[PDB]
């Protein structure tokens, strides 16, 4: 059941913004590790004396890496005279975010029809304002409200090229990498209490709970009208044998924040081959693969969807598999993206639910908690 | 003339430590960009609740990348109970360094016979103490004094594997990259006033001025007894037509600091081929090459040292060439390593002065300032 109760018109995920201490180095690492090309910049070379921002793109996926310059470069400016291309940016906020959380996501940005309306309606419905709507070069409106922890939900809308003041990256600098990643599927937050977090976010968006079908967590998924914007939220379960990974997140992150980003690949096998090639030469590592018993147990579960070959390929790459009552999903998880055991990345591909493919086809892998535990009872 | 006036026994450059906001991402980028393997770690997985430190090595070159964790992970510790592997580390100092300077070098570390003696004698001779000598697992002594800005000169000495508490990196994680870089040749500081900086550093080390042979700078090189430890220092020249790049450094860095690191390659041609292959896929960019007139002018200057082929190869790669009265050097410069126009890297290879090769053979490229200007008068 989907009540389609969005309080304003939402389109798709637009971009994810990381707040960094050095944007160059994080961006170059991510570019090579994920096969995303350098697409636009806003920095000293573009007249921006406030922050360095570098945009990586793969298909529709947009990753933005931003870091502050010395405040002294812009000490003469005021907000009316600012050279920043992202007017919500604040040196103190950025430095405090990075020093508190380490590398992580500051903004989950969605495109909307009218960012000013989305902000006003959100705030009228309990959203805590973070940055008021601002119109950029009479073309793009941007506004921000608090999502959880120090993460904001950013509304972007276009009257009619990333943002004004960003320049296209020179053809010599932008190598056309591509490992098959195409768009953001979902963005997951970790909080201490799921109930109040859900109430808040569902409160100001009108997003509805996405239906699904004891490992230390409870969760729930909020979804937009066409369920293409998917925002799961986790809370820890205390008192379990194995200490809750959600609680470990909260301790090392210094509170709530974005836990993982799920990136849809048009070919998860090519994506994982390409990423695994680069794990030890500057890219990303992957969590330990499941035991071969897990892959022997796949024939009974998805033998009508994956051939023995495609199952074998899953085993080569460590890919996990789950199934809805509607569809099937292939997924796998990176190790944390930075120093702390906090944010990681999920690679996903969904099979089924053709109408275009409907959102969340196959679910989010909830069944893989039990199937992993069961399969990892292969000590005999 | 070399008075060999070191006030304590100095061996060689031991390592360079960068202070980062996320050590993982900087280290992975540098590893791929420079062909340096992951050699040791000290982090959560090794019991270090204070800082993440990752060591990259190429030949004798050691690059250390360190970032702080949340202070809360170690809030119960005191210095006697610390889990940090680098006892000089301080959360507040590291965060203040990175927020003030952005990504850059915190420590120039040299190996000495006796780090406790080197510290005591240095401080008796005007050095500003930064971290007192501390003995690690009864095996290694480490001590730090101020060098310039927020950069320290670190003394390391071994009674008899990087530092205690560091673990070797698993054979699966450490890919054996190597683009030919073998050791640190020199480390250059930028200061507002050369005179007082030289007086200070020469004051507490006994390092002597290295002999050499209007583009906006003055400089001088301090050297150890065998002139294998080489510490040049620059100051800006104000009032020139083209604004002093040294002054631009000081403004964007918020004061004095390490300007460039010069890394010796055993084969600069292979090194530059390998690095240039990776410039646009996560590695380092290089400054704009000189005009072909520069390379036509090379036959008269080094035609007795480089063949037409090796000169042509220089032209392919943008390599610059200078000559002492003793030797010849090949050099080239990266664009800044991070967001700010501050620290960059020099790749160098020296030809001549065989006895082993004596330090600074060929100089530092001072003649290339005039030769670049002259050659870049090719507008007709
Ligand atoms: C995060 C995760 C998902 C996941 O993406 C979602 C679950 N719920 N929602 C809304 C999600 O997006 C699915 C399976 C597993 S797993 C390895 O157990 O098979 C895991 C992990 N557990 O810890 C490490 C990775
Ligand atoms: C830094 C530099 C050196 C250099 O390494 C040293 C000079 N003195 N000392 C002690 C040095 O180590 C040599 C030639 C040039 S250059 C491009 O002019 O030919 C440059 C640069 N100028 O600005 C950009 C790079
Ligand atoms: Co997920
Ligand atoms: Co140099």
Swiss-Prot record, chains A, B:
Binds 1 Fe cation per subunit. Keywords: Cytoplasm, Dioxygenase, Iron, Metal-binding, Oxidoreductase, Phenylalanine catabolism, Repeat, Tyrosine catabolism. Gene3D superfamilies: 2,3-Dihydroxybiphenyl 1,2-Dioxygenase, domain 1. Pathway: Amino-acid degradation; L-phenylalanine degradation; acetoacetate and fumarate from L-phenylalanine: step 3/6; Cofactor biosynthesis; prenylquinone biosynthesis. NCBIfam families: 4HPPD. Belongs to the 4HPPD family. This is 4-hydroxyphenylpyruvate dioxygenase. It comes from Arabidopsis thaliana (Mouse-ear cress). The gene is HPD.
